[PDB]
Each structure stands twice: as C-alpha cells, then as structure tokens.
Symmetry: C2
C-alpha cells in the first residue's frame, strides 16, 4: 500500500511558460486559452498593494510571452477571472484532452504536476488539508503548477498553485480563480489555519490495513458518534459526520467491521497509542487516503 499518483501524460502536453517582464511562471494551455496566476503582471515591488485592475489596463498583448517548448504563441487578447489570467492565443492546443474544471472540498486527494518554467519535473499525490493548504515540494518557480484527477478519459483540473506560505505549505486557486482558504495574492504576512487530521481518511486507511491482514487493533467494543467526537476534538481530529459513515459504508460491509466499531479502535490508538506496534508498517496514522482511493487501489 503506497501513495500512487495518477499518470501525468495527458497534462504534460498542456504546460507552457508565461513571461511578463521579468516574471516567468507556468501556464495551462487548453483549446486556445492559457491560464496562469494573475500576479505574473506584477513586479516584486508591486506585490505590496497591487491594483490588478489598473495593472491590466497598462499591459498589452505583446507584453506576454507564451513559450510552448520552442514554438511561441501569439497572445491575441487577455482577460481576468478573479485571480486567474486568461490569455487568448492564436493556436489551439492539439493535445487538449477531455477535461473539466472542478472545485474540490477539504480532505479530497489529487495529483500535482510540479513544473518549473513550463517543463514538468515531478508528480505527487496529496490531499486538501482542512486549513485550505497543501503539503508540497514547490521550491521556487512552480507557480501555475496544476492539480488534477483522472476519471476514465476526463481530466478534472481542481487546483492551480499561486503562493508559498512561510510554514512550508502552499496555497492556490481553482481553475476559475476562486481561491481556497482565507488567502489573497499579495505579499503580506498570511497565516494558515489550524491543521486538523482528516478522521474519515484515517478510518479508510484502517479498513485498508484489515484488507491486507493487519488486524491487531480490532477490539470488541463499539462507541457512539457523540462520544467519538469529544475524543477526536481533544486530539485535533475533524468531527465525524453521518455522511462520513455512509461514505465508509461499502468498506464497512466486506470487512465486517462497523464504522462505530472501527471508531472504538481509533479511540484506543488516539488515547493509549500504538503501544509499540505498526499499522501497515507505519507507526503513524495516515490521513491522505480517501475511501475512494482505498477502493481504487484494493478492490
């Protein structure tokens, strides 16, 4: 059981390099539009209090340099959708796959194609943290890197990297420029919220361990929802909901372990601990596997 990322081939052919003045970052080329963060029109000293509306008036089409490998594209017009700059080019991308723009919720997983200057360099699987950030490795030059899921033939684009927070974590928008969490695209002191553990993902991971055969944590006891939340809130675990129980329903059925029975095992691991044991070869409780991920990778 390892974190598998989606194959990136469909998204690799959509990455381009966008240059405005001295700023160079990554863009997404779909049909005849290049999507990129709007702070590409800003200098490093404009980022204090940027008035993006005035800044876009004073640019023109020739100020943007779109670089598709070695072929240049002519920006034939430009527009702005809340935090994302949409550059209309003269050439349609022949590699455009079946795609959709979606907005995911906290706790959901996706793959990220880390790119630098329009060149893909790595891919990894990650989850939306409950504080609206993501744990990534975007050292420097990876703004405009995108996150995605693949459904049969459809690539669902759900994330675009915009900023790197000083904690180590990173913040970004969806493809419509709506930006996850209480962040703005300004250089100012922005603090990420209080990061909690995705409880429903932990339970799905515990079900995965039972499927593989690691069953030492199973007990005879069962708890209630209301009792479990007090224990979970104390240990900074997201309150489990009834919908969470229904989502874990299919896993609860084959394992034979009810969600509230498995919750009683989780309570023991929270309070007493592993007691010098390992689950799936880990002394730590993993929370970046959604129930759907466990079903995809196991059944």
């Amino acid at each position: 059981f390892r974190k598998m990322a989606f194959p990136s081939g469909k998204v690799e052919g959509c990455m381009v390099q966008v240059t405005c003045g001295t700023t160079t970052l990554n863009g997404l080329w779909l049909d005849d539009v290049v999507y990129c963060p709007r702070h590409v029109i800003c200098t490093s000293e404009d980022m204090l209090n940027p008035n993006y509306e005035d800044l876009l008036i004073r640019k023109s089409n020739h100020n943007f340099l779109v670089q598709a490998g070695n072929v240049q594209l002519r920006v034939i017009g430009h527009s702005m959708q809340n935090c994302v700059l949409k550059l209309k080019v003269d050439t349609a991308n022949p590699k455009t796959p079946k795609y959709k723009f979606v907005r995911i919720q906290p706790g959901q997983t996706f793959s990220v194609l880390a790119c630098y200057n329009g060149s893909p360099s790595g891919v990894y699987q990650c989850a939306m943290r409950p504080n609206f950030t993501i744990k990534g490795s975007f050292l420097n030059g990876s703004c405009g890197s995108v996150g995605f899921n693949i459904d049969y033939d459809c690539v669902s684009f759900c994330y675009m990297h915009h900023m790197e927070l000083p904690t180590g974590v990173h913040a970004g928008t969806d493809l419509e420029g709506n930006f996850y969490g209480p962040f703005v695209d300004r250089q100012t002191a922005q603090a990420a919220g209080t990061d909690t553990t995705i409880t429903v993902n932990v339970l799905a991971w515990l079900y995965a361990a039972v499927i593989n055969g690691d069953r030492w944590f199973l007990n005879r006891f069962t708890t209630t929802l209301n009792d479990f939340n007090l224990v979970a809130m104390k240990y900074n675990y997201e309150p489990l909901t009834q919908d969470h129980v229904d989502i874990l329903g299919p896993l609860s059925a084959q394992t034979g372990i009810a969600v509230l029975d498995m919750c009683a095992s989780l309570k023991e691991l929270l309070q007493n601990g592993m007691n010098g044991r390992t689950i799936l070869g880990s002394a730590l409780l993993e929370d970046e596997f959604t129930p759907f991920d466990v079903v995809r990778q196991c059944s």
Copy 2:
C-alpha cells in the same frame, strides 16, 4: 520544511505500454522500436509454474499464438526470441512514440519511478528504492506483471526494472530489461525467501545533510566516531554498513556544510539510541532512506 517524494512524469512511458495475451494469460508489455518485451512466464499456465521447462514451452508456440494490443490496434507478431527471463516479440510496426531510451542495471539503494499498469492501461505512478535484499515493496496487484521502472535524465528514459513476481512476504521481484533477475530469485512458483531488509545508511546520511542545509540542526552532537565503530553500532539496529565509497559520495555535502561525514555518523547513532523525542526532521517523524545522495546534491 519538507522533502516530498516525487515521481518522474510518466507521459513518455505511457505511450510504450501494451497488452500481451498468450492463451489465457494476459500481462503488460513494453513496446520500443519494433520489439515488445514482456516476462517469459506469459507462456505458462498455473500448472507449469512449479517446474517450467521454458524452452519446451516456447518451442511449441507460433507467432499467431501471441496477441498484442496497443489500445485497440492489434500488433502483428512476426517473430520471437527469449533473452534470459524476458520474451522479445518482433512486430511489423515500429512504435511511433518511442522516446530516446537506455537500458541500465541498478544497484541496491538506487531510486526509480514505477508505472503500475493493468492489462495494457497505466493506473498509477510511484517512486521507490531498490531495497538491499533486491526487492521492492510497491503496490502491485494481480495483473501488474510487466510494469516497468524508469528514471528520466533530460529526454532519455532509463528503463531499469520489469516486475515479474510477487513474493509471499508481500514484496515484489523482477529483472532488468536484459532479463537478469535482481537478487537470487527465479521465475518459478517455489518457496523463494527474501533476505533481511536493512536500512540504507548512506541515503539516511544524505537526507540528514539536506536537513542541516534547510535548517534542522537539533540532532547534531559534538562527537565523532570511526567508520569501524559506527558500523558495529549500525548492525545492531539493522542498518547497512558504510564503506569508504559512501564517504566520498557524501563529500560534496560535507563540503557544502561544515559537518564531516564521520561527524554526521556520530549524530545518527545518537538518534538511533534516543529516538525522535517527538520532533521532526524535514517534516518527517521517521528516518527516511529512499533519497539518494545524487538527488539531494541536485535538489538542494
């Protein structure tokens, strides 16, 4: 604050994966130029697997017994040859999406990306390291045989691994693209026991050097040890012995920082005897050993 283990982008490998069917057995193949490489146990049934006479089985097959599909395009097999534990199927059509490629044989401790495929279709990609017992603990289900491992340097894909067998320990075993197994394993349904898995000491040391470069320094101590003394303690914790070659490879890292290698070795021993004490190193609660020194020296 954090190394996250990235895999290489898989696009160039995705266009080379095909489906090979012989009888009732279906597995994955690699299509390069005009050859499809795949494990030779595709010509076996479940009965043959305990004691297979591969040359008896292959001598009885014809070209039309091999069905190769690249998506919906049927590939027409015009010849076949066996190189060690791999079958080379010659087809009439060259793969139009063949990248610039190389075949390399890796050593234990080296890392690569694996493209997990199921009956001709890519499913997922992950990064792993060749363990010192010549196995990989990846995520392989039934029907992933023929999935390959690779590294990308500029535009050259280095194919280094092909999945062949799953061991009862839960780990996986395979060959290089020339058909030579990694480790003392055979393509036979017998009691094949993997060796003891040990931590890759040189990889942990390179990762610790990355930590001091970023700013994690709380684990440093004011002692130094000899290589012989360090290895004596290391084997007690199931760590691989450190050689003089490992010390030279870490040399640039010790030059970039101020800490000598044997100085770093004394800190590692202290971590082993005390544990983590609840703190983290590059946002990790465990000593991590799947980062090669070459990667650290690059992505500083």
